Structure formats: C-alpha cells, structure tokens
Swiss-Prot record, chain A:
Cytoplasmic face of the membrane: 66-94, 131-143
Binding site for 3',5'-cyclic GMP: 382-383, 395-396
Catalysed reactions listed for this entry: Ca(2+)(in) = Ca(2+)(out); Na(+)(in) = Na(+)(out); K(+)(in) = K(+)(out); NH4(+)(in) = NH4(+)(out)
Annotated organism of origin: Homo sapiens
Region of interest (Ion conduction pathway), residue spans: 143-242
Protein name stated in the entry: Cyclic nucleotide-gated channel beta-3
Domain topic, free-text comment: The cyclic nucleotide-binding domain (CNBD) comprises three helices and a beta-roll of eight beta-strands from CNGA3 and CNGB3 subunits. Upon cNMP binding transmits the conformational changes to the C-linker domain of the S6 helix to open the ion conduction pathway.
Swiss-Prot record, chain B:
Gene behind the chain: CNGA3
Tissue/organ expression: Prominently expressed in retina.
Catalytic activity: Ca(2+)(in) = Ca(2+)(out); Na(+)(in) = Na(+)(out); K(+)(in) = K(+)(out); NH4(+)(in) = NH4(+)(out)
Extracellular topology ranges: 36-41, 110-113, 165-190
Residues of the full protein shown: 158 to 609 of 694
Organism in which the protein naturally occurs: Homo sapiens
Positions annotated to bind 3',5'-cyclic GMP: 391-392, 394, 407-408, 452
UniProt-recorded name of the protein: Cyclic nucleotide-gated channel alpha-3
Region entry C-linker, spans: 251-328
Keyword tags: Calcium, Calcium channel, Calcium transport, Cell membrane, cGMP, cGMP-binding, Coiled coil, Disease variant, Glycoprotein, Ion channel, Ion transport, Leber congenital amaurosis, Ligand-gated ion channel, Membrane, Nucleotide-binding, Sensory transduction, Sodium, Sodium channel, Sodium transport, Transmembrane, Transmembrane helix, Transport, Vision
Transmembrane segments: 14-35, 42-62, 90-109, 114-131, 142-164, 191-221, 222-246
Residue ranges, annotated region (Selectivity filter): 208-211
C-alpha cells in the first residue's frame, strides 16, 4: 500500500474495487434472503456473522485506507499531497454515502434481536460497485462481454428480489393456506425463484390468485415484469448494436456500393475489384476511412499519432535527411492514405505528375514490361513532380503495384505550398532532384 | 384587464391546475359509468368533485378567453381581439361542447348514470399541453417519459377493465366461465374485488400474458381477439418506447465509448507505443470526467448569434479580464475575442510550441499550469498560470531584432491545461482596421525582444 | 388516352384496383378453407368474383395504355407502350392472374404488385404517413391472423372434426356448427398462437405437434417484426423532438459545466420555450442544405419577392441582380430587448425586416425615435464605406434577413449603378440625420 | 499448389466443409441423446461419419496450404504456410477435431464439434459474397434459433432419460407405450417442449422434482436471453432493411411539413411532390459522392468511366485529347436533375457552372416567347462561354442565351474553377475550347 494510488493503472486498486464489489454484492444478495427465508438459523448464525464482519471490515478499510489515497486532478495538475487528498475525499459526495452505510445499526441487535433489516443501510454503497463497473468496462478490451454479463446479473438480481418478496407474501398469507401461496414441499428458494421467473418474465402457468392481496401482488408483479422484459430487450439490443457498430457500418457501406454498382449495371471485373478493395480494407484497417476518425481529434494528438506512425517510414528515406521538422510535420498532417489493388497503375507513362508517393506496407514495381527496381515498403517514387509547375515534366516510367500496396500520397500543390515557405527545404530537395537529373 | 402569458409560469401553474380535473374526469368517469356501485356509494364525493371539475372547466374557458398570442413579435393585450381569435378556433368548440349542461339529464335520470357527463373528456388538449410543457420544462426528461408512458398505459388498462366489467354486466354475471362471477356471492361482490379483478383481467389481456379463463360465446371470442390485438400493439409500443429511451438515456456515453473504441482500434491496429496510447486514453477519460467532451461551437450552434455572444461573454470574460495586455483595449474587441476563442485541452508533458518553429496560433491560459522549458527536457524558467498569455510574438510579424518571427521558446504543459486557441488570421482579421492590438502587442513583442 | 403514372387518375385507378386484390386475398382463402361461407353466399361471391375479374382485365388494359419516360419525355406511342408492357414480368403475372371450388381461382392472388404500389403511393402522397403505416401494419398482421385461422381450420378438416382435442370440435353439434362460431374460434386460435400466448388446447398427434411448432416459430418472428416496426415508427415519429431535446440538454449541460449565471441560463430557457411554443424547431440553415439548387432558389425567391413587395425604397435595381441578392439573403431571429447594433460598434451586416418590430433608441434610454416594422429596412450606411450611428433594440420577437459583407462586396465589385442609387438614399438619410 | 483464400475455389471448399460441420453439430447431439436414431440407422451414420471424417482430413490438408498476405501479396512458400498454420490455435482445434476415439457411441465423437470456425467463416464469406445480405442474415438467425431449439430438445430428452421415463408428469412419458414409443413422436414432442420453453410460452407440464425445477428455471432464463437477443437483432435488421427508405421518407416528410408551414402555393407544392415522386420512381435518389466518398479516386474513376465515359465520348470537342484529363473530368463531374419547364441559364446570370446533357432533351429559348430554336439532345454541352469570359467577345460575364428543360433531364454540373484546374496542366484542350467559344460568340 503506497501513499497515493493512481486509480487508472493500478490493478491492485481494481482488485480492491473487486473486493468492495464482492462485499456489496454479498450484502445486496443476502440481506433479503436472510430477511425473508429461514436460513438465519441458530447454527449458521456464526457463519453469517463472520461474513458480515468481513464485509463491514472491507467497508471500513475502504473508508479509511484506500479512498483517502485517491490521486485526483484539480486545476489541471494532479494532486499527490495526502492531506489534500483526505480533504477532497471528506468534502465529496462519496463520503456521505459511505458514512451513511457504515453507521452501527447493529447496536439494535441487542435491542430488537437479530434482524438483517438493520444491515440494510449497507446497500447505500452502490457508488463503489458502479466505480468497479466503469473501471472494468474501461480496462477490458471486449466490453460487450461484461455488459452482457452485467445485464444477466441484473436480471438474476431482480428475480432474486422477486423470489424474496414472493416468499414474504407466502409467509404473510400463510404457507399452504391458499393455492397461490408457496406450498412448502421442496427447496424453498428454488420454487420461489421458479415462481419469480414465471411471473416476472410474464410466462404464467402458475396457480391463479385467490384473494385480493394475491390479485394485487400478481397484478403489480406482471406489470413490473413487462417493463423488466422490455428493458432487457432494449439493453441486449443496445449491446448488440454497440458491439458490432463498426462492422455494421462497414457492411452497410459495402452493401450500398454493391447496390449502386448493380443499379447502374457496372461490369463484373469492376464490381469484383471494388469488392476486393472492400475486403482488403476491412481485413487491414478494420475501418472504412481512417481520416473520418482522425479529423475528429485535436491537432496535437493528430500530430502525435501521425509522427509515431509515419516518422520511421519518412526518415528511412535517404532523400529526406536534410529537411526540417516543421515542414515534415505539415507533410505528415497532409499525407493522404490510399490503397492500390495488384496490377494497378500508380504512375502511367507520359501522364501529368501531381503526387508524391510514400509506399507504406506494400510492394510496387517500376516498368514497357521489364522490371528495373522493385520498391519495397518505406521507399519513395515521384521525385519528378517535385520541381514541375503546371505541366512541366511527365512520369518517366510505368509504376505498377505488385501487391496490395498502401501508398501515402502527397499532392504537388500542397508540397509546393509548403516548399515555397521553406526555401532551405526547397534548396536541398532541388539539389537532390538535380543530382537525380 | 389582465392578460396571462403563454410562456410565463402563471400559465404553467394553470396548466397543472387544469390537467388535474381532466385526468380525474377520464379515469373516474369511465369507472363510475361502468361499475355502478362506485357511483352509488360515494355520491357526495362525486358531486363535490363534479362541482370542482366544472368550476375549473368554466375557469379554463375564461383563461383561454384571455391568453395572448404573438403577432409581429408583440403579445396582444386587447381583450376583444383575444376573444375573437379564440372564438374563430376549434378549441372553443371543444370547450363549449365540454361544458354542455347535460347535468339536467343527469338529474332527470336520477344522478346514477354519469354516461351523460362523458363530454367532459373533450378537454384532452389541456392534458397534452401540460405533458408537453413538462416534457420541455423539467430536468428529468427520461424519467418524465417513463411517467407519461406508464400513465398512458394505465389509462388504457383502466378503460379496458371498465369495458370488460361493462361487457360482463351486459352478458350476465356468472353465466359463463369468462365473464365476471356472480356478484351475489360475498367473495366476488365487494367493490374492491370487482375493480382489482377487472384490472387484473385487463392487464393479463392487454399485455398478452393470457392466464384468464377462455371465452365461451362469440361476442366474448370477438372481444378477446380485438383486445389481444390492441394488447400486442400496446406491448410493441411499450417495448419500443422503453428501448428508445434506453438508447436516449445513455446516448452520450454510447458515442463516447464508440469514439474511445474506434481510436483504440486505430491505435492497436497501427501498434503505436503504450505511453502514447495511455496518454490518448487518459486524455479522453479526463475529458469525460471534466464534463468537456462536445465542442463549444457544436453545442451552441442551435442558439442564435447574439445569444452565442452573450454566452461567450459570460463564460470567457472573467478569464480574459485577468490578462495584463487587454486592459488598455476596447470592449468591442473583447466581445469579438471571446467570440473567436476555441478552447482546447492539453495533456501533461505535451509540447505546445517547440523552439525554432513558425507561429500560427496564440494561446490564452484558462485553468491550467504551463512552463517554458529548455531543450534538455523540463527546465522551468517561468511557470505560467491562469489568466496569462503566450504564443503571441510569432503571429504579429513585427520587425527590428535578430530573432525574426519563429517560436523561440519550448513550452510544455505541467498538468491538464485548458488553453484558448486563438489563430493568427482570425485575430488579425478581427482587429485589422483597429490598431489597439497592433500597438499593445507591438509593446509586448518589444518587451519579449527586450528579454532577447 | 395514355395515363400518366404520376397523375391523379393513376392513383384513383390504384385505389380501384387495390379494392379487389384486398377482397381476393382475404375472402378467397376464407372461402376455400371454410366451404360453408362459399356454399351459403354463392350469389354474392358470383357477383364479387365477376367484378374482380372485370377490374383485373381493366387493369390489364390500363397497364397496356400507361406510359414510361425515355430521355425525360413521356412516350405516347401505344405500340411502344404495348411492347414495353409485354417485355416485363408484370404482364406475365397479369396473364397468369387471368387464367380462366376456389382452389382453381388461387391465381388471382398474383396481382399483389398493384396493392404494394397503392401502399407506396399512399405513403408518398398522404399527409399522415405515421397513421397510414399504423393502418398498413395492422392490415398486414390481420391478413396473417386470418390466413393462419384458415390454415388451422383446413388442418382440422383434414384430420377430423372433433376426433382429437387440438382440432376444431365436432361440427355436427349445433354449437360448433355455426359459421360465425367456426370463424371466430379459428381466429381466436390463430391469435393465441401467433401472438405466442398459447392458451389453446395442446396437440395430440405428430402433425398437430409439428404444425404448432412451425406456427409458434412463425408467430415469434411475427411478434419480432411487429415490435421492430412499432419501435422504428416511434423513433421516426419523435426523432425531431429527440434531436432538439438532445440539443437543449447539451446546451444545459454545457452551461452547468461552465457555471454560467442564472439570468443568462433562464434567458436561454426562455428562448427554447419560445421556440417550442411557436414551432420554430427546424432551422433553415440546415433545412436548405439538402435541396437541389433550382428548388432551393424557387422557394427563396418566392418568399423574398413576397416580403420585398412590402419595401418600396429598394426598388431602383436590376431585376435578376436584386433577385440573387434576396436569394443570398439569410434569416435570423432576435429576442426582445436585444441590441441589433450598439453605438460604438462597427457593422458587417445588413438587415431586412419581416414580421418584427425594431425601434431605435438613444444611449441607454428607452425612447422610440422611429420604429421600424414589416416592410422597413436598415443596416446600409456602414457597409459600403464605418460605424453604426443608431442604437437599435428589438421590441418583440423579430425576424431579420441578415446579410453578409461579401454579398454587398460582390454587388459592389461588379454592378455600380444600383448600389450608387442605394448609396444616394443612404447619403440623403445621412444628410437628414447630420449633414 | 496454393489455395487463394479470396478466390472461388476457397468458397466452394468452405461450402463443402460447412456441410459436414453442420451435420456433425445437429445429428451428433441428436444421435447422442435419442439412441433409437443411433441404433436404427447405423449404416447411414457409418456412411455419413466416414464422409465427414474424410472432409475433415481434407480440411486440414487444405488449411495447411492456404495462403496469407505478407507485404500485401500472397506467399506461395509451402513450408512457410505449414509453419504459419502450425503455430496457431486453429491447428490445435483441427487436430483435436480428428482424433479417432471410436459404432456404439456417438458421445466419443463430440470432438468433431470443435470445427465451428469453418461454419462461421462460410457464413461470413456468404454474407460478403451474396446479393441478398439481409435475407442471408435473417436465414442465419433462423438457423441459429433452430440449432438452439434442437439442442434443447435433445437436452430435455436426455434429462428425461436420466430421471426416468414417465415417473413424473414433467418428463417425457413412458417409453414402453406404443404411442410414445416411436422415434418420430419422441423427437417432435421434445422439439415442441423445447420450442415452448425457449420461446417462453410455457404451456408445457410443470416440474415436480427439484432438478426439474432447476432445469426449467435455467432453460427459461437461457430462452429469455436468447430471444431478447433475436428480437433486438430482427429489429436492427428491419431498421437496416428500410434505413434508405426511411431517410428518403424523412426528407419527404420534413419538406412536406415545410411546404405546409411555408404558406407556399399548391403549384410549387405539387412540383416538389412530383419531383420527389419522380426521384422514387427512377431510383436515382442517393448521391454518388456520398456513397463513394470512401472509395479511392482510382476506383471512383473506374466506376465513372464505366458509366459516363461511354456516353460522354459522343462529342466533337474532347474525344481523343487526353484520357487522363477525361478521367479527372469524370471524377470532378457532379450530376443534377432538373424539372420540366425549369430554366438552367438566364439572361444575366453569373456563369460559374458548365453543364453536360445526359438523358435529357433541352431547348434554347428566347427572352420573350416560348420559341424552340434548336433542341440539344444528350451528349451536347452548354454553359462554357460565360465561364470562360474571354477577350474579343462581348465579355459581360453573363449568360448569352436561355436554357430550359423540356423533360426530366440529368445534367452534369461542372464548376468554373474546377474546369480551369482540370485544364490548367494540359492547356491545349483549353485553347481548343476557347477557339470554339470565340467562334460561337462571334457568329451568334
Ligand atoms: N524512371 C525511373 N523512376 C524511378 C526509378 N527508381 C525510382 N524511380 C522513381 O519512379 C518514378 C515514377 O514516377 P516519376 O516519373 O514521377 O519518376 C520516377 C522516379 O522518381 C528508376 O530506376 N527509373
Ligand atoms: N521567448 C519567450 N516567450 C515567452 C516568455 N514568456 C512568455 N512567452 C511566450 O512563450 C512563447 C512560446 O511561443 P512563441 O515563440 O510563439 O512565443 C513566445 C512568447 O509569447 C519568455 O520569457 N520568453
Ligand atoms: N442613423 C440612422 N440609421 C437608421 C435610421 N433608420 C434606419 N436606420 C439604420 O439604422 C442604423 C443602425 O446601424 P448603422 O449605423 O449601421 O446604420 C443605420 C441605418 O442603416 C435613421 O433614421 N437613422
Ligand atoms: N448564346 C448562345 N449560347 C448557346 C447557343 N447554343 C448553345 N448555347 C449555350 O447556351 C449558353 C447559355 O449560357 P452561357 O452564356 O453560359 O453560354 C451559352 C452557350 O454555351 C446559342 O445558339 N447561343
Ligand atoms: C347468483 O347467486 C344468487 C344467490 O346465490 C342466485 O339466486 C343467482 O341465481 C346466481 N346467479 C347466477 C347467474 O347463477
Ligand atoms: C359428431 O356428432 C354426431 C352426433 O352427435 C355423431 O354421430 C358423430 O359421430 C360425431 N363425430 C365425431 C367425430 O365424434
Ligand atoms: C411403463 O409401461 C410398462 C408396461 O406398459 C409398465 O410395466 C411400467 O411400469 C411403466 N413405467 C412407468 C414408469 O410407469
């Protein structure tokens, strides 16, 4: 246990929130059960007291030695000083619920006997369970599995509370008095949980209620079960839609492109090339267009995620050793990513030159049909459109993509736009172009 | 005399005070019409509540006779013009039909049949107007949508329960297995037993659970299939409305988690470094925790331009008055400046501007903590704080010294600073013809190059 | 005669041909499966079957004499229309649906394309598309309830009346022998099975078990389709209200995050209250994005000539040039008590008032020097060469046609004489206020 | 040889390996649980199990020679393919799906069920290779529901056989009675019980003993989770089935409430309604830019030259000048649809667009009367002299003639600056079109 816990990178703090969640789940799952069922017998009462003391000691350790150690951000910078952390926890709205949970209402154990309705204030510490839910849902890589498991747990908990309320109604009317109430022949929690399932899922088939309390109970339970079943439908639909949102949007765009290409009667080879492009884009990037994601980010994180991805590819070019950092940064923020199918033409001979190609995880060939040099990933081609303004010079070789090349395009207008602002970079680039010529 | 205002709060309190007896009239008019012992036993209570509901209906006709409207932006206060505009509508016909004195017939039958008072349900527009005003007025719109949907299906289930008891009274009590049992038996003859069992029947039918006794005659078969189709459309409405407000109740958290999972999928596909990935994810978690995730222009785009200007004044002028250079500047340029600022948030260790770069932005610090450092890492010469400004000399392009016009300082953020990003072009366009920024920022560039 | 497929005669014929297809589906499966409704209403089904055959051959004639567009122009060559009809599969469905015991008349169900075309034309043409979709989904689920009731009675008649407990009972008993009893009990069994309630008598034989399994799975998918359609219809009904409530709540959460003052947040609340009271939820700046440019220009020039016939000062101008100026004119709405322009403020905006009331005032003193109304105009002396010389407030909720600086720069760098007339009016009012 | 995993041979093999996997799942749980089906048709299950084991051996032999993509191209190195297969978890699943642990027990053949990946890969490749994607996804959901129903039928019959036939009212009845002793009635009553319990209708006999109570609780809960999942999935399928129609009708509805609230006359109202009805009837509603923004410019140009170039090459001005500039121009074109009786160009409008006529007949009208001077058919062009504004002409920067639409034409808009930058690099075509504009405006 250190002086200050960071509460983002601490799996020890996540395990402590797991222990407070297990204490809170013990209290929520076993206060109505011990309150209603006769499972708090004179033999097992020492085990219930042992686990209740373990749960209250976990609550008190949370209130005294972990929650006053939380590193929190105030005024931009983080706070490490321990008395300021203690003051921030004492002036919080977590502490009112924690001190509202930890009052010894178990001093009424000697006044009105043993009753687990006096421990019902321990069900006020829901904020530690929700903090554990957010922490596990934000450290897991597949959060839809935990959201499905948590909705299943909420459904089983509502059925557990309904089984406890049904056994209370059975013991209030009299066990075995009418035909609606619990008869009392098998496992009491199992038959009451079966009644809770068959009522709150609105299945029916149970005996019909006889007197007015039973009709009111069955009415309110079926009415709340309609809304629980509707909320379960909506929550499973929500986790289905949030789990496959990217793949469903990609499949929708691929289906719209296929529907357009079949509406306008586009030939088989062009339709196969578009479908092969879509298949390789999903198998490579797992997204449709990465600029649609990247242009929602701020400029400095766009610059960081551009420099960390593309700087080894740019600096491994031996022609870019004399350039400057700001021009390379504006380059990396103005590099557009394309993709070329095998056998495609990136630079046809004699055409107008307008793009600078940084090949990134591909393999292209230069050409007639004879190969001269097979350019691997990281290399460059397109230095003849570095100098030409307007028409100027043309492409001097047929450049073809051997594999699924993923070029990085730099337009000639943007390259000349940044180059006329940095004449030192223009000088070294024109001298390397001159020794190429 | 006095004219109420349909945007005020006296009108909303009258919408509450008139959406009470409309709801009473719907509920207890169908129940008193169909049950016939609830009407006979509590007759003084229903005469008292009928007097109160018709007094409130007369006062609602009087208030709709004096509710102003908007023509040419001004609320009309001429009572004859308000009365004429009210009398040339259909709501006046609905209120006049909803106050037809059929209580003469209600007395002629003998105050036992409230079927002649069924025209009092014609003021449903006040109930719908109150639910619309509370839906756009209250702070909990999803909790109010649950309250309104539960209220609507409780109206429907109650009306169906009274309809089933009326059909059972028309067929005959206790003749078949489907109808309500024999009301001379003392177990089934209590009024609470009648209403609670009919409500149980109608919930079991209209929610398509079906544990009720099956029909015998053809009228019962037809009523049960009509009731089951109404119930399957009601169950579809319940499921769709609850799923729609589950998608509404966490739409912001859903798109936030979608943005985090999209950027995390991009960072795990490109396989960037773990410190950069943790920096971006902690950046997004800080923007979630500090309630600043949706951009300011995208929030205030539904507002008009002068309301955006007043919001920008009342948010950013308390920060922009803590500066030392815009004291000798005009209030109009202060308003235009807070219209121009776009607030961005940086991370600890993030460089704002490196040394030897060119400037295209100016930053105004607002609840942050920065430090101008050397090239060796962190070496805090001046620790900047709230209210101050930096990044200012390399956008004016003033002449006369050896530094020219490039970023001559390395500046990092110590904590999660929240700067005010001000570009070169929008500042120099907002204060092109007005020389205050030129002279004051030339003085500030003069003292920066005096430090040079 | 050549019928236009977008006219009103074509929609009246789509109604007149959607009548007998909706007769044919319903009552042909009911007659064929019940065999007493056929046998005790024989003259009525003779009349209605002859009328449905007459309307079917009239629909073959009308689809023979309706026209399709080539190169944007409607063909009226009847031989070309007949060959274009003959090359399609709808003609094959019509001649299969007119091939001369209702089990031999079950080719009359093949003209469902006219019913689907009627439903799509009503969905495009009616004013209440949500009410029409409610009615259309209720009609579809009633067709499936009815067809499954007839299928259940056919399976019961094939197995035996009253042999098992699952089947329809013995029709020799005068209680289960009535035709109304037969139909409403088959409909009640169909409703209980397709809505998955299951209050029916349980199956006994293997064909009864298999039919109830297939019927319950079909009813589960029908329930899922009903739930999905009503949920999509509810979301598309209140999507505009939900989008503006999301914008209202994002405004409120941004205000409570920045801790803005109480007077400004209740002013924003009052603005949203005015917006929802006077139904100005949708904004023109996003409405006129998705229009084609010609349709964007027609409604704009319509409403702007309608409001420009109220102003008589700005008339000495070229026709299409004033037209494009009031095309690029743009509306904003001001709150009451709001200063349009202050004393010490430099303008970049011109205004045209429609349905508002703006009064000019002095420095911090409410007094009406001259009040501007519908048909007035202002905002012109500090834009063509540089500071507003009159405090102007909004008395009520006014609606002003704003104007960018670059519109008057475009009407200045190309066309001098109309703006010289405008500047002469501006100079005369300038000399009038302070020569 | 190397099987390409994107070819058609790999999809034929995915069909031929997702047939015995689905057979193995379905009939292996049925043969394990019912045991009259296993005991009677022993020759049929011998033939089908030998065929499924032969197809599993050939599946391992094909997966040992399926290529992958390194540096964007296929690798044909067979030893590299074998080691890249060998260091995976699919090798462990495909070897554990082939160990011959066994004619008396199909329960020692439950390791054949481990090859779920081939069935899921066949479903994925069919969903991305079919033309009816929502129909195949509804078929996939129905197939998953039927497998869950069938497995629950077999599980209920195994639980009935373990508890005892006909000892309770909940279990399957007494197997020695000749009514219930038939295998067809066994399977169809177990399917009926499983369908009712998993769809949560619950009109079957209630449980008696505590293990029956626990199994019916667990099975109702598994059923409510799986069927809330498929209700939400069919709802999302319906939303994706009519998202396009919903967006079209949303545009229509919003503009119809706008026309009701905009005090607009019935003429412009029926004009807007007939234009949207024409858009629906001619199925050209969606924007090509919006639907192919994410495609690269090479494939957008291939689509554009496979739709519009074979209707654009019937011109006398740019027919063999530059194929690359024609590619750039059909990339930069933007189509619009004009109503009949609508003006494209007026006397005095600022000319910033050029128009190419495609599927439409337009007519040059005069200033006062409706005079058909000459009808321009499709493949013609106008709006060029005013966006040039060249010296030696009248040079007023207005449009020198009126253009009006006779029918529902589809003009290709092309901006002034766009044409200038497209003809900037190679200006010989610009000089040629300048010459044509000069002669037209000088002998107008
Ligand atoms: N012609 C040619 N270009 C090469 C060669 N190696 C790399 N490149 C680059 O490939 C190019 C393809 O496009 P460019 O004509 O624009 O210019 C050419 C060069 O920059 C080579 O051996 N020949
Ligand atoms: N060089 C420098 N800049 C300072 C100092 N104090 C504040 N600043 C701002 O820090 C800056 C960092 O970026 P700029 O070069 O753009 O411009 C510089 C100044 O505006 C200081 O002491 N030196
Ligand atoms: N000064 C002045 N402006 C008027 C008058 N009537 C309308 N206006 C407009 O009110 C204005 C307020 O702003 P401006 O100075 O920009 O320009 C002025 C005019 O366009 C009037 O009588 N005097
Ligand atoms: N003036 C004119 N334009 C024509 C004629 N035939 C086709 N056009 C096109 O019609 C035009 C209308 O718009 P523009 O002025 O832009 O340019 C003109 C020409 O491109 C003709 O006979 N005269
Ligand atoms: C109801 O009960 C009374 C008294 O028990 C009896 O006279 C009457 O016939 C009963 N009604 C019916 C319909 O049986
Ligand atoms: C139906 O009833 C008649 C007379 O009641 C009887 O003769 C016949 O056998 C019955 N049919 C069946 C299938 O029981
Ligand atoms: C099943 O039937 C046989 C003969 O019909 C009988 O001997 C046996 O006891 C029955 N089993 C049960 C569990 O009833």
């Amino acid at each position: 246990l250190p002086n200050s816990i960071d509460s983002y990178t601490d799996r020890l703090y996540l395990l402590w929130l797991l222990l407070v969640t297990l204490a809170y789940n013990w209290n929520c799952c076993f206060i109505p059960l011990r309150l209603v069922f006769p499972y708090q017998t004179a033999d097992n009462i020492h085990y219930w007291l042992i686990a209740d003391i373990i749960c209250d000691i976990i609550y008190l350790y949370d209130m005294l030695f972990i929650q006053p150690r939380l590193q929190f951000v105030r005024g931009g910078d983080i706070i490490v000083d321990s008395n300021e952390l203690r003051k921030h926890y004492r002036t919080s709205t977590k502490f009112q619920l924690d001190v509202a949970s930890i009052i010894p209402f178990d001093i009424c154990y000697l006044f009105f006997g043993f009753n687990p309705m006096f421990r019902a204030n321990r069900m006020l510490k829901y904020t530690s369970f929700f903090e554990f839910n957010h922490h596990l849902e934000s450290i897991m890589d597949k959060a839809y599995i935990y959201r499905v498991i948590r909705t299943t747990g909420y459904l089983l908990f509502i059925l557990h509370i309904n089984a406890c309320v049904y056994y209370w109604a059975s013991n209030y009317e009299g066990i075995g008095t009418t035909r609606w109430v619990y008869d009392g022949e098998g496992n009491e929690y199992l038959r009451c949980y079966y009644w809770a399932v068959r009522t709150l899922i609105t299945i029916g088939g149970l005996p019909e209620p006889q007197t007015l309390f039973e009709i009111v109970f069955q009415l309110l339970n079926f009415f709340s079960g309609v809304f629980v079943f509707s909320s379960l439908i909506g929550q499973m639909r929500d986790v289905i839609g949030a789990a496959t949102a990217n793949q469903n949007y990609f499949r929708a765009c691929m289906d719209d492109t296929i529907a357009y290409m079949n509406n306008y009667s586009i030939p088989k080879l062009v339709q196969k090339r578009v479908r092969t492009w879509y298949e390789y884009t999903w198998d490579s990037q797992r997204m449709l267009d990465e600029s649609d994601l990247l242009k929602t980010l701020p400029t400095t994180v766009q610059l960081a995620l551009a420099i960390d991805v593309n700087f080894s590819i740019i600096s491994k070019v031996d022609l870019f050793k004399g350039c400057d950092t700001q021009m390379i940064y504006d380059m990396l923020l103005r590099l557009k990513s394309v993709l070329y199918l095998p056998g495609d033409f990136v630079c046809k001979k004699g055409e107008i030159g307008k793009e600078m190609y940084i090949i990134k995880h591909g393999e292209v060939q230069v050409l007639g049909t004879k190969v001269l040099v097979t350019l691997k990933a990281g290399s460059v081609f397109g230095e003849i459109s570095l100098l030409a303004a307007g028409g100027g010079n043309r492409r001097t070789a047929n450049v073809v993509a051997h594999g699924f090349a993923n070029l990085l395009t730099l337009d000639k207008k943007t390259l000349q736009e940044i180059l006329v602002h940095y004449p030192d970079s223009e000088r070294i680039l024109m001298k390397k172009a001159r020794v190429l010529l | 005399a006095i004219v109420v205002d349909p945007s005020s709060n006296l009108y909303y309190r009258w919408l509450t005070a008139i959406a009470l007896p409309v709801f009473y009239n719907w509920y207890l008019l169908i129940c008193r019409a169909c049950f016939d012992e609830l009407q006979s036993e509590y007759l003084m209570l229903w005469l008292v509540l009928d007097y109160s509901a018709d007094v409130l209906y007369v006062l609602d006709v009087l208030v709709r006779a004096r509710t102003g409207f908007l023509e040419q932006g001004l609320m009309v206060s001429d009572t004859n013009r308000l009365w004429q505009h009210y009398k040339t509508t259909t709501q006046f016909k609905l209120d006049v039909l909803s106050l037809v004195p059929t209580d003469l017939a209600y007395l002629k039958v003998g105050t036992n049949y409230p079927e002649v008072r069924f025209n009092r349900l014609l003021k449903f527009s006040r109930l719908f107007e109150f639910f619309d005003r509370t839906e756009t007025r209250t702070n909990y719109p999803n909790m109010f949508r649950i309250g309104n949907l539960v209220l609507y299906i409780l109206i429907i289930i109650h009306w169906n329960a009274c309809i089933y008891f009326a059909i059972s009274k028309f067929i005959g009590f206790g003749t078949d297995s489907w109808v309500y049992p024999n009301i001379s038996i003392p177990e089934h003859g209590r009024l609470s037993r009648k209403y609670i069992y009919s409500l149980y029947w109608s919930t079991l039918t209209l929610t398509t659970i079906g544990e009720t006794p099956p029909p015998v005659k053809d009228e019962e078969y037809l009523f049960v299939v009509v009731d089951f189709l109404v119930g399957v459309l009601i169950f579809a409405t319940i499921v769709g409305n609850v799923g729609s407000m589950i998608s509404n109740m966490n739409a912001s958290r859903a798109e936030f988690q979608a943005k985090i999972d999209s950027i995390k999928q991009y960072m795990q596909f490109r396989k960037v470094t773990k410190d950069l990935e943790t920096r971006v994810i902690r950046w997004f978690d800080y923007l979630w925790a500090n309630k600043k995730t949706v951009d300011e222009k995208e929030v205030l785009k539904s507002l008009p331009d002068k309301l955006k200007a007043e919001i920008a004044i009342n948010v950013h002028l308390d920060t922009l008055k803590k500066v030392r250079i815009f004291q000798d500047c005009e209030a109009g340029l202060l308003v235009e400046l807070v219209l121009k600022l776009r607030p961005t948030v940086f991370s600890p260790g993030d460089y704002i501007c490196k040394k030897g770069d060119i400037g295209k932005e100016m930053y105004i610090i607002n609840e942050g903590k920065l430090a101008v450092v050397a090239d060796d890492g962190v070496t805090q010469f001046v620790v900047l704080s709230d209210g101050s400004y930096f990044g200012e000399i390399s956008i004016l392009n003033i002449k006369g010294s050896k530094s020219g016009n490039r970023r001559t300082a390395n500046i990092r953020s110590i904590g999660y600073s929240d700067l005010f990003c001000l570009s070169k072009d929008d500042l120099m366009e907002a204060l092109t013809e007005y020389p205050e920024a030129k002279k004051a920022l030339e003085e500030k560039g003069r003292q920066i190059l005096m430090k040079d």
